[PDB]
Design a protein around this ligand. Sequence first.
Ligand SMILES: O=C(NO)[C@H](NC(=O)[C@H]1[C@H]2C[C@@H]3C[C@@H](C[C@H]1C3)C2)c1ccc(-c2cc(F)c(F)c(F)c2)cc1
Ligand SMILES: O=C(NO)[C@H](NC(=O)[C@H]1[C@H]2C[C@@H]3C[C@@H](C[C@H]1C3)C2)c1ccc(-c2cc(F)c(F)c(F)c2)cc1
Ligand SMILES: O=C(NO)[C@H](NC(=O)[C@H]1[C@H]2C[C@@H]3C[C@@H](C[C@H]1C3)C2)c1ccc(-c2cc(F)c(F)c(F)c2)cc1
Ligand SMILES: [Zn+2]
Ligand SMILES: [Zn+2]
Ligand SMILES: [Zn+2]
Lengths: 514, 516, 509
Amino acid sequence: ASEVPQVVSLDPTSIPIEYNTPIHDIKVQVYDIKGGCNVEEGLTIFLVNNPGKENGPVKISSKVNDKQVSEFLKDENMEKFNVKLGTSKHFYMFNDNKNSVAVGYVGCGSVADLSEADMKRVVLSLVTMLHDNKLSKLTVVFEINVDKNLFRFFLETLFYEYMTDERFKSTDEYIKHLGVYINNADTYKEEVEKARVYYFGTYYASQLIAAPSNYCNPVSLSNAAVELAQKLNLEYKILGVKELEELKMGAYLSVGKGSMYPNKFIHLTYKSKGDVKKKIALVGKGITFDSGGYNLKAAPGSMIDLMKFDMSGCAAVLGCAYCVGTLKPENVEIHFLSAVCENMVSKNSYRPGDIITASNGKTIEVGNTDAEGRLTLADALVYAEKLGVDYIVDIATLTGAMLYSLGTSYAGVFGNNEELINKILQSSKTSNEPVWWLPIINEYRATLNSKYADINQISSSVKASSIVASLFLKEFVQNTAWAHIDIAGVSWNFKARKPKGFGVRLLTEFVLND
Amino acid sequence: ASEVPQVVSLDPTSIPIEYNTPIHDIKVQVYDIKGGCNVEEGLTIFLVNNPGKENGPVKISSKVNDKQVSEFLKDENMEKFNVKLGTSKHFYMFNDNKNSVAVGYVGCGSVADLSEADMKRVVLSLVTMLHDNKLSKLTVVFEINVDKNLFRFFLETLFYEYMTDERFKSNVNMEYIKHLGVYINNADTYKEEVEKARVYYFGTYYASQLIAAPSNYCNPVSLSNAAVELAQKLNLEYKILGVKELEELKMGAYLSVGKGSMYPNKFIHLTYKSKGDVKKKIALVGKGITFDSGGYNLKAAPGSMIDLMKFDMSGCAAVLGCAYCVGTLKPENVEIHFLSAVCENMVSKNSYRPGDIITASNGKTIEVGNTDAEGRLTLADALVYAEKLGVDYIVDIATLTGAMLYSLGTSYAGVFGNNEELINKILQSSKTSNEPVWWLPIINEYRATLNSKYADINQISSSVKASSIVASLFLKEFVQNTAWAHIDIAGVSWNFKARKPKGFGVRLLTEFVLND
Amino acid sequence: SEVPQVVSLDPTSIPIEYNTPIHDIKVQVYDIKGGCNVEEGLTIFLVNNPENGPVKISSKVNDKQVSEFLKDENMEKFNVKLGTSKHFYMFNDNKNSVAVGYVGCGSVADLSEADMKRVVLSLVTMLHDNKLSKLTVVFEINVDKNLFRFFLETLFYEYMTDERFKSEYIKHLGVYINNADTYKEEVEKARVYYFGTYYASQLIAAPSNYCNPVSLSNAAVELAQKLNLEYKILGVKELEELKMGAYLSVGKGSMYPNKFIHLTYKSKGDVKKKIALVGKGITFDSGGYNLKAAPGSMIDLMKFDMSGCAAVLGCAYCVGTLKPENVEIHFLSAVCENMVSKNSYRPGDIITASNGKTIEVGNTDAEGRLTLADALVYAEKLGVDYIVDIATLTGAMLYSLGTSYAGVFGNNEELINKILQSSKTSNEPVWWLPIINEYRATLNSKYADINQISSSVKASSIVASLFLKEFVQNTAWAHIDIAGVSWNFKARKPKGFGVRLLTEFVLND
Ligand SMILES: O=C(NO)[C@H](NC(=O)[C@H]1[C@H]2C[C@@H]3C[C@@H](C[C@H]1C3)C2)c1ccc(-c2cc(F)c(F)c(F)c2)cc1
Ligand SMILES: O=C(NO)[C@H](NC(=O)[C@H]1[C@H]2C[C@@H]3C[C@@H](C[C@H]1C3)C2)c1ccc(-c2cc(F)c(F)c(F)c2)cc1
Ligand SMILES: O=C(NO)[C@H](NC(=O)[C@H]1[C@H]2C[C@@H]3C[C@@H](C[C@H]1C3)C2)c1ccc(-c2cc(F)c(F)c(F)c2)cc1
Ligand SMILES: [Zn+2]
Ligand SMILES: [Zn+2]
Ligand SMILES: [Zn+2]
């Protein structure tokens, strides 16, 4: 526990965090469709498609244990509506006990199996039916086929989108029950609490990312990490400047020199109770605010006002810690690392041109102070390898170029080991968090040859910034399977103006399958 | 009717126009709300507020002639929803006769007076519902207060927003209603607003069709042809002036702009004259640049949005849209001239150049400092021509300066003038048309920056950044002794959010003509 | 067709060299087993050391003079750092003046194509600086047959110098290598691949006033007749009848009429695979009214916007020369020029592709995908199994893959894998990038059926891919974006990237 420094007494000294969310009070009940659906209080929504027929008619296939509601939902009545992806309708009628009931459907399109992108659109339509309607219960009937992972993804996304983050509201009700009808209900029931765990890890990462830099700063973010570890029973260590100096983490320390906040290195650990068969280090980039430094983000479109999100990597990692500490995987040991700091303009800031020494002795010539993430990661990666692990995986909002390469939907993965990269890709598939393998092209290595230092921070000629950054990071892992997940493009949801909490599920699937 | 030149045979030779729209098929009935509501058919939507209570619950007061819908509308059920402006819900159910109806509402907030802006939000929320509706009838129940002019705005806005422009497409989820029912206090006073709204709608939709039509469809030849066709449908006098006539009139400023285009300049002159005695002569002048590249001052800078510059003939579109309304409604005692010097501003071996000195048809020489200030050049000759007609009032409408975006923005247009009475009359038309306009000064202190070293006058200023004022000072120099006002709609003409035209100006100009 | 001129001094053809000094080089491969003979010219040893360690030459040299020079103690003074070279003049046993030296091949045992390029360059440097009758190269390293072929191709290509616009070479090449007999058939394959690549380079390097739509399609014709390939040049009257409104719009502003190029190779005998190769052919890209005016848009490079076409024609030369079996190939290119005029198409214009789809033009500098849409409609009407297009399409490739790797997108995994397999055996490196369907919605025009560009999504190369995907209804299709990879910025010349890639793809299938 460290005291957060303030300039005035109105400066915040902690990150407000909501642990007990309304979502956590929702009772979930799954039923097999074979038994028929009961339509009573609340809203009962059918998820319906029509394979191959673009805007085909709605047909309700499930038995509804009610004569009135069954009559209403007959084919002749439904044929006037179509299944176009994301279309929806509210129905109102009285049931057999002369009570009023609300029914409806969401269109799931014409394709037999939904992509995670489509499912997200289905959820968004559903969440629209929940908003602006004081409901006590929602009931969802699956007339579409989903695999278990996508069933879980449906739940996680539902919980995440429905939830509203109101921590910073001053002057400006959720359902209590969720029923789900699906074929083979027993096979899906185990997905429900996993979805709840995954939702909050995701949502937790999002609260830290969305928290502005005056609230979420290196000291308060590491304070939150400690607090998280205590609630979860993880081991933790927070390295302050004095310890970091002794470890000679020159790269990391140089970046934070300019900040009124002292750097804090977060190290959480989860150990299994049984024999440890696999050791892992997860490393998240943790710049709580990235002004660019003396290479100030002043150019049009540099979006300096978004740079609270430059610790999204760290948040994904802490979010993953929540899931792993909760679900408690066996036969594994996990280190959660983040070299947290803040990149500022000051009389004490490191300068463009400065030559700095990393913790492994490699000297680095700084060409651009706005390329700070790779400096902090270099020391975090050296530290990580000294732990003696089997895999190192870093996750980071490293390069703007990711927006020109893969866009806002897929993250990019780089690495030095093919078996590790495929495992990341397998996690991508099962978490439904899209990731694409990109090359580390060695031909570009020579532009990192500094005239004076051992290595250039940046390339003066090569414009493929994501690859060059990966080449730089590679120099700081000597002998361990390593992968890099650049999330600079997928971290923020620009349409909805909120974080995605991207990566938490991806990392946790990786830990679990292993 | 002139022939449209083509580069290849696949180039279009006319602007497609929809004259008959499904809006024109909708039967409109207005009923008095004190009698309660019939809801046995179609879609019934209640417009409701909750004064004082921000985001307050929905309460429906009206008696309805169906027990089922009555139950649905009980306070216990309706209070699960709130009246946040724009928020809507609607449900399908079976009525007393076991027929399918739909019932819902649109929230109108917590304030008893709806702004025009607020009303557009309500209308948009309604239209969203209609775009997923296949029911034959829409019934709108006003449990809020509205006035005759606000109600007519609701109708015009509803019609325009409801109609979609599919001319360049090669729903399956909606269908256009055939009946629209309105329940409102004092139905009989509001009835006459209906066909007026239908007229104002089409004039506005017609302008929008011209504006949205891309510059390979909408060029000076095709636009002048369209105007001729319109004039013939309305029995208007018309004449289109070509290059040789324009040269004889010595329109050097306007002809300079068009030099670099493959399309010959065409000057549009339509006339409406009332059957009775003529007491007021008015000239309506619309800027008609069918595409604005900037010329040699090419629109290359960040934010110059060259891909939207098909809209630089928006002023032309509003004056032709006004001609529809006028020719249809036929006001008495007035003679109105609809003017536009139409051309295209391009980059060619033949284009005029930055620095060129040119001579306007009133003899004034002009030093061109920026070829992208070409609108004021075409207007200069159009203003001279209009003053020659011997009118009492000249009003120009034009997408003239980008600086409107920084002064009034996208909601309010700006009016400048040389005559207070005419300006006051414009501001009144703005009020009753619900097309907002704000009076800005012509500050004479800036005039000296237009003193060219070589020519009679400068086109632009080299110092003053208050563009909109400077361009007005330039225009003023081409109206000698007539009451004149200038409406700058550059900020206001396009609807960025909805990616379509507003057709701004049609109703404003028509109201000015009808109520003066 | 007659090339139009503004002034009498305007050129009316592309100068093309067919018979090059390279084709006059006698190439001979020997097995290292029976020692190496150092009798004339320059002898170069390719050596490594499995880090910047010392040069140790292992092969036996049948000359007392050269052997004492290559003695381990002398050579230790030199290191094997990749790309470094030394070479000394000396007199051999019979008082002949000979030159002996080495090129270091680093410390890793398996060289990438990138390292191999570095070996070849340092080797070519010496050839340029020395009047030699004969180069001998000794391989004391391990290479694939593919990598061996790559060595030659690169050697020839970099050795050759293009002096067509200006106002000596070895006559013999000796190669000593382990298992000589397995590498002998790679020699003339390499010679062919060299010229396919050098030919494409000549067209790319040719400035726009020499290489315009008329003169470029004239050259394709001249190439077709020399190889006896079926050919067909479609002109404006035909393109209009075919209703290619997107492609015709791009060229409306040019003084050179559009020319659509169609060449065909058919193997003698049973044909099992039909293929359409489509190259982007914009002979100069000014950008149109969306003028390349912004810093770093590099308008002076934009003669290179025809690299995809050149790639395809270079491939036609290789396929026309090697005559693979079981295949029918259609080499397509909608050639035109993108210019600023009174006749130019405008941003905001709505135009109609030959399949009926209307397109809203958001940016005239995205002209490539417009011409490609109409080419792809045309290609699919040919009834082929695969459509592969190659294009300098989006500048974003620079920021995703850079100047070394091209990106490939497509609608069929089996075809994409074939392209990737050809990438590895041609040693022209390509990387698979996704077509992300979630971005499709930003091509939903308010007025037309589809947008040419996105106003929101910044993943240009993918959006462009999504756009092209709409013009292939039912055929396996891939798209190779070579914008970042086409021009060699350090050598200030073209790479002619894609010729060998497309040919291996044809050959391996
Ligand atoms: O500062 C950064 N990481 O710590 C990173 N900057 C870079 O990639 C720049 C920096 C470092 C490099 C050398 C040069 C060009 C490139 C690579 C300056 C970066 C990260 C995200 C973004 C970014 C900007 C946005 F507007 C945006 F919407 C977004 F999602 C990401 C831009 C730059
Ligand atoms: O080109 C024009 N009229 O033909 C007009 N140009 C200007 O106002 C500029 C031109 C002409 C001037 C000298 C200098 C500054 C000012 C005045 C360049 C103008 C009008 C509208 C817009 C404009 C741009 C937008 F991106 C936009 F969204 C909009 F609604 C309007 C930009 C420039
Ligand atoms: O002109 C082009 N295709 O015909 C292409 N332009 C783009 O990708 C831009 C164009 C077209 C688009 C709309 C907007 C942003 C994007 C997409 C302008 C493009 C292609 C190559 C390059 C390019 C520029 C360089 F300086 C360079 F060295 C290079 F290798 C390629 C730049 C733009
Ligand atoms: Zn940075
Ligand atoms: Zn202009
Ligand atoms: Zn271009």
